[PDB]
């Protein structure tokens with residue numbers, strides 16, 4: 529009963545319980561003539577909530593905050609954007625206006641600025657080299673190397689064995705990349721292998737768009753990427 533793209537009108541946000549204190553958020557948005565679902569994460573951080581990624585736009589992100597207040601009722605105090613594109617930073621200004629401290633790597637912040645996208649306020653240190661990991665409250669942030677973008681991060685919730693791949697990990701049903709602007713197709717498989725190496729215990733893998741799966745999504749994504757490359 530994970531919600532699917534046809535079930536969520538653009539502007540609405542669903543929450544899905546993955547594990548105790550771990551949710552995904554699911555929203556929908558138009559891009560390149562079609563509407564796509566998009567996932568982010570919500571993780572309990574003591575009495576606060578940590579948000580991973582916006583809901584792909586200001587309107588959706590406002591709906592996300594409203595749904596969180598309705599269903600969970602704890603304040604979102606920090607947010608991390610996992611790369612610079614609009615499905616991850618679009619809505620940052622809404623978050624800030626609501627009192628959320630927004631974060632991204634220096635690279636993500638710079639790239640968002642260059643792109644004309646919203647810019648998270650605070651820089652995350654310790655993530656500039658492939659294989660780098662840092663703790664951020666109840667999650668670990670990991671830079672696997674260039675893949676979907678040069679700056680992309682993935683997020684692991686060690687208490688729940690949940691790995692959120694962002695746009696670097698594809699859902700199982702997805703057999704094409706679509707738009708590959710800003711991707712590093714040549715490095716992407718290598719970056720995936722780094723994720724596998726670091727999180728071999730992951731029980732739930734959440735792609736950037738679409739249905740949750742397991743670690744099988746890693747090899748699947750590599751296959752799709754290579755098949756584009758070929």
Ligand SMILES: CC(C)OCc1[nH]nnc1CCS(=O)(=O)c1ccccc1
Pocket residue numbers: 559560564565613614615695702705706707708736737
């Ligand atoms: C925000 C935008 C610049 O990036 C969207 C994106 N995120 N990950 N890949 C893509 C581009 C391929 S897509 O065909 O538009 C696609 C989108 C989502 C789900 C499946 C397929």
Ligand SMILES: [O-]
Pocket residue numbers: 613614615695
């Ligand atoms: O994206």
Ligand SMILES: [Zn+2]
Pocket residue numbers: 611613676677695
């Ligand atoms: Zn992207």
Ligand SMILES: [Zn+2]
Pocket residue numbers: 615695736737
């Ligand atoms: Zn995406």
